[PDB]
Amino acid sequence: GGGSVQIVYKPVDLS
Amino acid sequence: GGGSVQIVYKPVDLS
Amino acid sequence: GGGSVQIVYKPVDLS
Amino acid sequence: GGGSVQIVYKPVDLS
Amino acid sequence: GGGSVQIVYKPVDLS
Amino acid sequence: GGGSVQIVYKPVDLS
Amino acid sequence: GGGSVQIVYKPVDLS
Amino acid sequence: GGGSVQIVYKPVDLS
Amino acid sequence: GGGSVQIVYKPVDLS
Amino acid sequence: GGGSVQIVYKPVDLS
Amino acid sequence: GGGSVQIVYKPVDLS
Amino acid sequence: GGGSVQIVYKPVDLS
Amino acid sequence: GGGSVQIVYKPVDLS
Amino acid sequence: GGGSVQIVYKPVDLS
Amino acid sequence: GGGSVQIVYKPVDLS
Amino acid sequence: GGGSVQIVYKPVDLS
């Protein structure tokens, strides 16, 4: 098994 | 198995 | 097997 | 097992 | 603008 | 604008 | 098990 | 601009 | 178990 | 501008 | 068990 | 500009 | 400029 | 236990 | 410029 | 200039 990449991406735009 | 990429992408737009 | 890409994409638009 | 990369990315834009 | 995800995925099988 | 996902996917099979 | 990299990344832009 | 994720993913399977 | 790298990265931009 | 994440991921599987 | 590296990185830009 | 994260990830599996 | 994080991650699994 | 490294890094840039 | 973090992480697993 | 942090991390697991 060649490993793992996990990404949680949650940009928030205000005003 | 050549590895793995997982992405959770949840942009939120407010006002 | 050449690995894997998994994406969950859930944009939310508010007000 | 080829290790693991985990990223939480939450940019915030204000005013 | 809720950001961007860009992915280049080029699996190679040899021999 | 709910962001953007862009993927370039080019698997190669040799020999 | 080849270890682990964990990143929490939260840039803040104000005014 | 809500930031950016860029990924280059090039798994190689040999012999 | 090949150890562990943990990073908290929170850059802040003012004025 | 909410920063940037760049990843180069190149697992190699041998014998 | 190969230990641990923990980093808290919080650069501040003013004026 | 909210900084930058760069990762080079190259797991190797042998025998 | 909000600084920089650079990581080179190369786990090696043998025998 | 292979020990521990902990780093708190907070550069502040003024004028 | 808010400084810099550079990490070279190379865990090795034997026998 | 906000300085620099450089880390070389090479844990070795045997028997």
Residue numbers in the entry:
A (entry chain F), B (entry chain G), C (entry chain H), D (entry chain E), E (entry chain O), F (entry chain P), ...: 302 to 316
What are the paper's exact sentences on this?
Residues 297–391 (using the numbering of the longest human brain tau isoform) constitute the proteolytically stable core of paired helical filaments (PHFs) from the brains of individuals with Alzheimer’s disease. Here we use time-resolved cryogenic electron microscopy to study the in vitro assembly of recombinant truncated tau (amino acid residues 297–391) into paired helical filaments of Alzheimer’s disease or into filaments of chronic traumatic encephalopathy.
Cryo-EM structure determination revealed the presence of the same filament at 120 min in the PHF and CTE reactions. As we observed no evidence of earlier filaments, and because this filament adopted a cross-β packing characteristic of amyloids, we termed it the FIA. Although filamentous, the FIA does not generate fluorescence with ThT. The ordered core of the FIA comprises only residues 302GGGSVQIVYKPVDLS316 from two antiparallel tau molecules, with a predominantly hydrophobic close-packed interface. At its centre, the side chains of valine 306 and isoleucine 308 from opposite protofilaments pack against each other and are flanked by the side chain of tyrosine 310. Whereas the β-sheets in the crystal are flat and stabilized by additional crystal contacts, β-sheets in the FIA are twisted and stabilized by additional hydrogen bonds between the hydroxyl group of tyrosine 310 to the backbone groups of glycine 303 and serine 305. At 120 min, 100% of the filaments that yield interpretable two-dimensional class averages are FIAs, but they are no longer observed at 160 min. In the first intermediate, the FIA, only 15 residues of each tau molecule are ordered; the remaining 80 residues are not resolved in the cryo-EM map, suggesting that they remain largely unstructured.
